[PDB]
């Protein structure tokens, strides 16, 4: 696995609770020896006036699930920041919740590159993803 | 002046109620010949797990305010999807509110490119985004 | 079989010649399913001033790749073009030949995203990018 | 003034000679405050198959003046490694002579976000991106 923190999937969201995370009810359901997933609702904090998924609502659960992955693949008091982060918005959601998969595209001792791709609740791609992170000791 | 539809700030911020815009309590402040800002507020809902602004909840504001400028710049029954969007995180905030000065860098028929800067209280700049968006019917 | 138009790699090279593909001497060398790829040499011109490979030459080689994989999935008069291009640099290469991988992330009617990674002759990641394109008619 | 070493137009042009810049005829040509610019050619070395300029090509020239301003803002040792690159392309050139205008949004002890703006020689925008790049000193 590409872990290097020892954190249980309750930690992840117990650590979102009293934030933005906690706030969208965005949840990490599933890790595994190289990727990460959460899922996100598609209700009234993440929809737009007219109903869809606010493209901004997907780009949260991205950087969300990215950055915690990076962040767990430091050690100590290493930390992780997002960089520069862009999306490609693909497919509109509607309802039910969404499901982001995240991906390592590169892992360094200073930065990483990872891809995160969210799917529908019928596993259609509604967001694809890309977050660049640095690493830092302050 | 690049607008092609005519709207209240007052109507805009009406909009946002009851969806992600209201919760996040986004508000529209200014609009100008060819320039629309907004601001929100740096907390709890906007925050990452360890105290400053949430990478994401910028760029929620950076397609909030991109994506309503351009459907002001198209008309009758048009709309505007958002297609692509980018940003590179400069500069953390902890407090207060961010606002979000959006100008358009290309404004055709069938595409458009929206730059997006957001700002701290104190005027430095936190993040550089642009979102591409599309014009479509039906 | 993504492919609409039925062109070899020696018709693909030949529309290269007289252009910046054939100055950089870009020679794709293999159409799958699914998949593009081209090699570029690390040389006189697309070397920086020390010897390595200048970041700007991977990403031409880049959107090379995606464009004309995006153009081979259109038909007739339709042609592609490159509205937003994103490359992280990973590792710099410093002779031999590059080879760029390029895959579909989503293919539409009227969009298209691309994803290119780029290895050195070692088959070590130099550059991983993503190309988002527009189908037009005009 | 951001600058932390002393250079001439004439060296900067004079480095590019044998390699990549050299060979695409990039030179550069005003030095400001804060900004550094360079001009490049709409010819067969720039352009792709049906004649418009390379996007790959805006890159080039993209990345070439900010790596470079990036290294002028940085002192002894110090070096500096393009880390990511995004752009979006808004206008395709034929002709002449295009111009990048760099200038910096974030210059930091360990990163720097450079903003490249390509124009036409009519004062049209073709092409805007960022470069994100790593203070490395060996």
Redesign the interface.
Known sequence: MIWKRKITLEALNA??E????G?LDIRFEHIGDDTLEATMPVD??????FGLL????S??????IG?VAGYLCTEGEQ?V??????????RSAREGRVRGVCKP??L?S??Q?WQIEIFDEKGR?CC?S?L?T?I?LE
Chains 1, 2, 3, 4 share one sequence.
């Open positions: 650590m979102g009293g934030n933005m995370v706030f009234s904090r993440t929809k737009q006036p606010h493209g901004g609502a780009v949260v659960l991205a950087e969300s950055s930390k920041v997002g960089l520069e982060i862009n999306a490609n918005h693909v595209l590169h360094g200073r930065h590159v791609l694809s890309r660049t640095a830092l």
